[PDB]
A paper describes a structure:
Staphylococcal picoviruses are a group of strictly lytic, short-tailed bacteriophages with compact genomes that are attractive candidates for therapeutic use. Here, we report the structure of the complete virion of S. epidermidis–infecting phage Andhra, determined using high-resolution cryo–electron microscopy, allowing atomic modeling of 11 capsid and tail proteins. The overall structure of the Andhra virion follows that of other phages in this group, with an isometric head (capsid) around 500 Å in diameter (vertex to vertex), connected to a 400-Å-long, straight tail surrounded by 12 appendages. The head has icosahedral symmetry, with the tail attached to a portal structure located at 1 of the 12 fivefold vertices.
The capsid is a T = 4 icosahedron containing a unique stabilizing capsid lining protein. The capsid has T = 4 architecture and is composed of 240 copies of the major capsid protein (CP), gene product (gp) of ORF18 (gp18), arranged into 12 pentamers located on the fivefold axes and 20 hexamers located on the twofold axes. In addition, there are 240 copies of a small 63-residue protein, gp19, that we refer to as the “capsid lining protein” (CLP). There are thus four copies of CP in the icosahedral asymmetric unit, labeled A to D, with A forming the pentamers and B to D forming the hexamers, and four copies of CLP, labeled E to H. The Andhra CP (405 residues) has the expected HK97-like fold found in all Caudovirales, consisting of an N-arm (residues 1 to 82), an E-loop (83 to 122), a P-domain (123 to 180 and 344 to 386) featuring a long “spine” α helix, and an A-domain (181 to 343 and 387 to 395). There is a 62-residue insertion (I-domain) into the A-domain (residues 276 to 328) that forms 240 prominent protrusions on the surface of the shell. CLP (gp19) forms an S-shaped loop that lines the inside of the capsid. For subunits F to H, the N-terminal 28 residues form a hook-like structure that interacts with the A-domain of a CP subunit. The chain then passes underneath the neighboring subunit within the hexamer and forms a small α helix that connects to a CP subunit in the adjacent capsomer. For subunit E, which starts in the pentamer (CP subunit A), only residues 31 to 53, which connect with a D subunit in the hexamer, were seen.
Numbering used by the authors:
A (entry chain C), C (entry chain B), E (entry chain D), G (entry chain A): 8 to 395
B (entry chain G), D (entry chain F), F (entry chain H): 6 to 60
H (entry chain E): 31 to 53
């Protein structure tokens, strides 16, 4: 292999990296011999490249419609329901003093709290980056590609967070009355039909009022209209219903719930810490950096309940302290009233101003946005999931 | 007030599953009624005309 | 936390509870340090709440159409049917005195008696409730919300009682001849078809005039049109018909009885005590209070046959003394002529006048109504249930 | 006199399970008709006009 | 007679293949008696042939639409994608110097440069090919017939290579997440139905960015739109879908994916060498000549990864050094994004000039073309294959 | 950019299998907004009109 | 002539009594020469009657006023009264909780029973009653006379029963406290005059609310106004009472003691069956028939407590089984408030339609009416009777 | 000394029993 290809003294990196360098040069002599670039007819000609394509893809958020723009002014918020009171027989043997005795309306209420701010950063060099691209137009495509990608990443993350929120709520918060078990896919599709009908009649079974402050003992009866019901299921199930249940049935004039399905391939894949891990190794920070966390440095503490959205389990500190939020088993259907989601976002002034370091000719750009995602206890939800 | 939206390019309708006709909020007890003749007399003893067999 | 956070003396409650209190105060000092409200930037500003939400839901009573307003004047009611007379041949051999011989019309009768008067109550503070809401408008919505909930509860309970009445009648009261048995759900669908056709013919088997007083000797033949027949079933059974039986049949052009079906999720869950149970514990009264029972107090006796309409079984006194009105075995299809239901109500002057306690600035309001629910033996009715 | 209501958003028709055409409240004997001439004459001998035999 | 026919001294071949030969010919008497061609009226006339027909057929390449004409000018091409960055929460306790820190955009790239310059040649004699055809019109047809057959071979062979490239990529390059196992054909059809839906979601599972240079640690999420998903399967599966699935299903409207399928009778059939094999045996060089490889000579080296496209395994040197690019188990459904294929071609000046050998009177025409086939890692792909 | 083409003479349509409605690219966050009143004042303190109770 | 008159062969009766009587009559010669009816001027003419008187004595029920028409449907009569409450002092020192105290009203009651229905009938013969009267007009009077005698009979019977009710009630069903004892006829007059005034006093002692279900414990003060007081005494006793000077002073004042005092000669003549007798002899049925009883037949059972209203003691079946309802001892004054005698009656369609036998030319007419007689415990009653 | 009143017409029931003017 020729010495020149191996030699690093002549690299551009060498010129920029060091304080003083050779101002004048007479060109080195190139040969393709015993190298990947060898050409039979002519050795001694530098390799020539035709294209440099961008291959940029646009991704979207399924749940964007739910997001509602809001001002960022105050932190807490609250909602309440007046709890049910059964009509009681007129005893008439009671003392006349009962008229005076006072009982007030009883209510159950929740406080949700403030949101979380998120940031992304990219810097464009204006010197070395120019060496990489043959034409000025290719470099401009590259810059827009970074901005375009940055927004797409945010959409993808928000979708993951909403999908994970729902899967976590069902797995942990739901009561026994809400939960149901499906032995097999055929049973599951039938169970989902039963659920749509069941949640359209008055029932206190599916409410989570008990978790709310005033519901420890008591009942709240709510009814959920059909338009609202929407179902989050794994794709395997939708494929089955369309491929087998719908195709085989003679009459499906009514009785089709596929408009409501929000099928996702995984549901699982968003991880949540437990046990308050503290970053301690370079190798750990390097993995996080690859996924975009410039901020992270050794000695920072990651609190319990932190949601990563990428697999950090293998790295040392998180080895036994990370848990995955996912459906348990292949069969999963969380059938819920749409009103429960509570997603709000503020995008005013999302793209922050550029900062230019004259030394090094680099401009750093930032994108900052606010997101609050939550789930309301009061509305109806039902989980049909694989039997244990 | 989130509103669910269509998630399919094409599908059959869901009318058969809909249970609005069976049970809806409109079907409820009416509280606008006023008291019967007996009640009005209990409250005010307005009517002093008749006492049935007397003397 | 700061001392102020936990200090009872600084509370508004103390001002109301004690007979004398400090008229003048110089305000206390607020800090968010080491408390849930901590704000990174300020650390000395009070927490701020953006919104408060009622989440009121309106609930209905399936059987409202049936209810008939009536005066509340007299305790008992009766219904009777004139019994059948078979045409006889002219025997001219008989003595002419037969003209004088007398034949009298005959009848079978039933007596159904008293009603039930039920009450609900709520008290509105005026003086201290105002502290809770930021705007007067939120507080006014709070008062409409308690009234609306109160009314919705009356509707849910009445529905539960009518549903329970039918389930209880079917399991216990129904004449043995009327009962029919289906081995599988597929058989049940066929059984329903046979019954709908059979009961439209002129026959005495379906009617329960035998139970009525005059039926022991003689016959009564009644006919029930399709326009009136109605079916009470669990939701899972209706789901079966729609998902599989209707979907699978090639031609359901006619032959669809699902218009008639009234389907309920639980079709049970109304509980009736089997022994006299005397309230004996504080914890028990507290559970009852949570469901709105202000009247309940220790030492009161609940007589046998009392219907709770909520699950009181767990409580100590009622542990072995409660039984549930429920279908047996998961196949229930009580098919009955609609005329049999007998639902009567009196809601005249339903919203009793308010009582204002000038001391304490409180007005307490009440709702009272009468309900009679019963089932008539005379009309046709056949139950299809799983084979025992 | 209760009467049923539909209770379903859409359904296939229920014709074919109905025997209204086969048996109905009508399809009953007519009470209203008066005696034939012979009967009226037995009740009161109104027709004194005709006797077949000659004097 | 048999003895005359047997003698090869009289053969035309002997005159053509030797330096000197006997110019004068004394005729050989021919008798048709007791031979297959005997005729009743004249028993000494040599048999006469009526037609000499060609039976030429035209074969075409399935994948021609994909091919893009390009000038053959430069060796390499490259393409790249920008890697995903997850949004990071605003710490706000980080040192204020973080603004100065520089975070650069990151990407993954691939270099694909290649060409193969495939050729083939045919020679028309003008002496001795005449001996074969009686009318000069058929002899001219024979010449056109070779050219057309040579062209058909180009088309059939390119198809084999595109088909083989795909089977090879799937069998070896794909990750565990992409791979799926199907026990039976019904299970497979459902899996194909599921994969179409899975690909439309946003997921990094089906991308092969990890193989690319910058993707070793990070993640890239891409979405594959329908209308750009083509599925490659065997005909046995397509036949199954049409015969037993599409035909039997009541509601196949909407659920038919057969427009996408690119079914081949047999996906396997192309062989790739492992190890290096020198053509030691003469018998081997002769076999390769049967397939049109005049170039092969004893002692030449066949490099690792050479793709034969015919079964060379039985030959001695290739006995253990050959491995077939093939589906495993008869169930194969490689579903992929169409964009991944990258087929390019240069066919300018395809029909090179003829060279007339004055000695031997032979023309020697040549056809040369350039073909580049490669598969891109970035786009989504899934393989459903028979369960091990 | 290769483009898939029809490989079959006639087929039932593929509509149901499409999630273009469910997760389209166009459904995405919007970056065109400008900062709110508070933000503009942080950047330039341009509003000096109101200081609340004063003097 | 004595002999001609004696012969009964020449009688209208013989012809009507038997079939095949004599059609043609040649008149019998008549002479009064030695008989009664002889006249100085014309010895031979038949005796001629100036008039047929038809004397009819109208008889009436004295108690007919104080009869309440009832329009009967249903059977029982309730008769409640509300018990007394005594006014109480203000007692302003008492706790303010006294405001709440039920103070429910209290009452007494008496369920009387149902009333017997009675009938009478007369058959009028067109054929032979005509022989008796000279002119048609006299015969028409005779028909009116029988109907009027029947009406007169209803009246005497009802009067007798009301009188007997009082005598029986006084002797047997009376509160012991009410009774008084009179040693001599003179003492009785003093006692009776003392009693008239006692009723006018407002006191609870005279009334029988102590019986009447209701309350033994409380008091009901009843007052009997003059004009509502009347004394049931024997005729001799009435003479003694009127004779006294007090009676004269009352009449001078304006109250007619004579109308008030009501007297029957013996207050006796109504008989009560004891011992459940049954008719057994022809002679008895004939006696009962003389008194108008067509219905009676041998073997009919007369229940204990049947009120005959004529002396049947002589007849054998009733010889030891009849007891007269009569005051015991000569002295008997029962002074009662007039309102006490409940004497409700229904007289609609009193004269039922006629029935024409048509053989014998006789029409039978019937009079039917409903009578209910009872005495109320609530009003003041005192009985003064001779000391045992 | 008043007397029982001789006649008034039959109640509605009486007339309908006699005629059965069904309606």
């Amino acid at each position: 292999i020729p010495t020149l290809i191996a030699d690093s003294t002549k690299a551009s990196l060498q010129d920029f990296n060091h304080d003083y360098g050779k101002q004048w040069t007479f060109g080195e002599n190139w040969s393709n011999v015993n190298t990947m670039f060898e050409t039979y007819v002519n050795k001694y000609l530098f390799p020539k490249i035709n294209e440099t394509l961008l291959i940029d893809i646009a991704l979207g958020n399924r749940f964007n419609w739910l997001a509602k723009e809001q001002d960022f002014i105050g932190q807490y918020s609250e909602e309440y329901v007046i709890m049910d009171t059964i009509p009681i027989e007129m005893n008439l043997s009671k003392s006349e003093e009962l008229m005076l005795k006072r009982n007030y309306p009883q209510m159950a209420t929740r406080l949700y709290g403030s949101g979380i701010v998120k940031k992304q950063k990219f810097t464009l060099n204006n010197n070395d980056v120019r060496f990489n691209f043959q034409t000025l137009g290719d470099a401009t495509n590259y810059a827009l590609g970074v901005l375009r990608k940055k927004i797409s990443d945010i959409n993808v993350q928000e979708e993951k967070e909403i999908r994970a929120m729902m899967v976590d709520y069902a797995i942990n918060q739901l009561q026994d009355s809400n939960r149901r078990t499906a032995s097999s896919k055929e049973d599951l599709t039938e169970r989902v039909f039963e659920a749509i009908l069941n949640m359209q009649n008055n029932s206190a079974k599916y409410n989570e009022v008990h978790k709310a402050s005033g519901g420890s003992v008591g009942q709240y009866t709510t009814v959920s209209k059909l338009s609202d019901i929407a179902i989050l299921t794994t794709d395997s199930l939708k494929s089955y219903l369309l491929d087998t249940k719908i195709a085989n049935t003679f009459q499906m004039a009514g009785i089709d719930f596929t408009d409501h399905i929000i099928s996702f391939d995984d549901l699982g894949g968003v991880y949540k810490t437990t046990k308050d891990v503290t970053l301690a190794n370079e190798d750990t920070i390097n993995y996080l950096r690859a996924f975009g966390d410039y901020q992270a440095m050794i000695g920072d503490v990651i609190p319990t309940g932190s949601v990563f959205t990428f697999n950090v389990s293998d790295l040392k500190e998180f080895k036994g302290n990370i848990e995955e939020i996912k459906p348990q088993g292949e069969l999963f259907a969380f059938i819920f009233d749409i009103n429960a989601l509570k997603y709000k976002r503020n995008t005013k002034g999302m793209l922050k101003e550029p900062f230019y370091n004259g030394e090094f000719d680099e401009v750093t750009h930032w994108i900052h946005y606010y997101s609050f995602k939550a789930m309301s206890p009061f509305f109806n939800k039902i989980l049909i999931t694989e039997a244990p | 007030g989130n509103e669910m939206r269509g998630m399919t390019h094409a599908n059959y309708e869901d009318s058969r599953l809909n249970k609005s006709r069976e049970l809806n909020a409109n079907m409820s007890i009416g509280t606008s009624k006023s008291e019967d003749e007996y009640g009005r007399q209990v409250h005010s003893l307005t009517k002093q005309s008749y006492s049935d067999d007397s003397v």
